[PDB]
Amino acid sequence: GSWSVKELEDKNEELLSEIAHLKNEVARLKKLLQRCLAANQELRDAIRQSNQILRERAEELLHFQASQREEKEFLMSKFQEARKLVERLGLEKLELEDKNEELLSEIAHLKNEVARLKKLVGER
Amino acid sequence: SWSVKELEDKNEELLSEIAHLKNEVARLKKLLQRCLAANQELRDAIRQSNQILRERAEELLHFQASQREEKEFLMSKFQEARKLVERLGLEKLELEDKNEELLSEIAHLKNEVARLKKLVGE
Numbered sequence: 001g002s003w004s005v006k007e008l009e010d011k012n013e014e015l016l017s018e019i020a021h022l023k024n025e026v027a028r029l030k031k032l033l034q035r036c037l038a039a040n041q042e043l044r045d046a047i048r049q050s051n052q053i054l055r056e057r058a059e060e061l062l063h064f065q066a067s068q069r070e071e072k073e074f075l076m077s078k079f080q081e082a083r084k085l086v087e088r089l090g091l092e093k094l095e096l097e098d099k100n101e102e103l104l105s106e107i108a109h110l111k112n113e114v115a116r117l118k119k120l121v122g123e124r
Numbered sequence: 125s126w127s128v129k130e131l132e133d134k135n136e137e138l139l140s141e142i143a144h145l146k147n148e149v150a151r152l153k154k155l156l157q158r159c160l161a162a163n164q165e166l167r168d169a170i171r172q173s174n175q176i177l178r179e180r181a182e183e184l185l186h187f188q189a190s191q192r193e194e195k196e197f198l199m200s201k202f203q204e205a206r207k208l209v210e211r212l213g214l215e216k217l218e219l220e221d222k223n224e225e226l227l228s229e230i231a232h233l234k235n236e237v238a239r240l241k242k243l244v245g246e
Contacts, residue, residue, distance in 0.1 A: 001128050008131035015138035022145035029152035036159040043166035050173040057180060068191060075198055082205035089212040096219040103226035110233035117240035124244065 003011075126134075 001132075003128065003132070005126070005128060005131060008128065008135060009126075012131065012135060012138060015135065015142060019138065019141055019145065022142065022149060026145060026148050026152065029149065029156060033152055033156045033159065036156060036163065040159055040163055040166070043163055043170065046170055047166055047173070050170060050177065054173065054177065057177075061184065072195065072198075075195070075202065079198060079202040079205065082202055082209060085209050086205055086212065089209065089216055093212060093216050093219060096216065096223060100219060100222055100226060103223070103230060106230055107226065107233065110230065110237060113237050114233065114240060117237065117244055117246070120244045120246075121240060
């Protein structure tokens with residue numbers, strides 16, 4: 001047969017020792033694959049969260065901005081009506097000051113006239 | 125004591141078991157390297173997303189710094205205008221009072237002038 005009993009028993013023990021190594025290797029790789037898929041699950045969980053935060057930061061920024069534009073607009077309207085009031089009041093104060101000057105000019109004339117006339121009453 | 129034939133057949137049985145376990149080693153090796161590479165792409169996506177996250181937060185912080193200063197400045201002009209409105213409204217009231225007084229002074233001076241012209245025959 002060419003191979004004797006002793007030669008085949010020796011080969012059989014070599015194949016058994018090789019099965020033992022390959023079984024150990026299968027066990028080691030099953031354990032690495034398991035830990036690797038666990039780590040994959042944590043990274044997909046992390047990615048999703050980072051994205052959920054990105055999306056909420058972006059909507060928040062849009063509501064805040066619309067809110068800000070509404071209060072800036074209302075404050076500007078209050079400022080502009082106050083500034084118009086300043087200019088209107090300035091303009092009425094000036095027309096009134098001008099009237100008062102005419103009135104005082106008339107009063108000056110009327111006081112000169114009563115003086116002239118009182119001197120003439122003192123001489124009749 | 126096993127015969128040559130029985131041992132040859134066991135030899136072949138052990139070779140088939142070896143061939144199965146070599147297929148299982150190669151299957152596992154390929155799933156693992158696929159999963160290691162998928163994890164490395166996820167860690168590169170996480171890095172990028174967090175960097176963007178950092179940049180937005182810094183841009184937002186300085187943006188709200190600038191908005192708050194613009195609003196404080198506009199509120200400051202409004203308050204100053206209001207102070208001016210109050211003061212000017214008081215000065216206006218005083219000038220209007222003076223106007224009314226002067227019209228009464230004129231009306232009485234005119235009556236007096238007329239009475240004096242009578243007296244002097246003018």
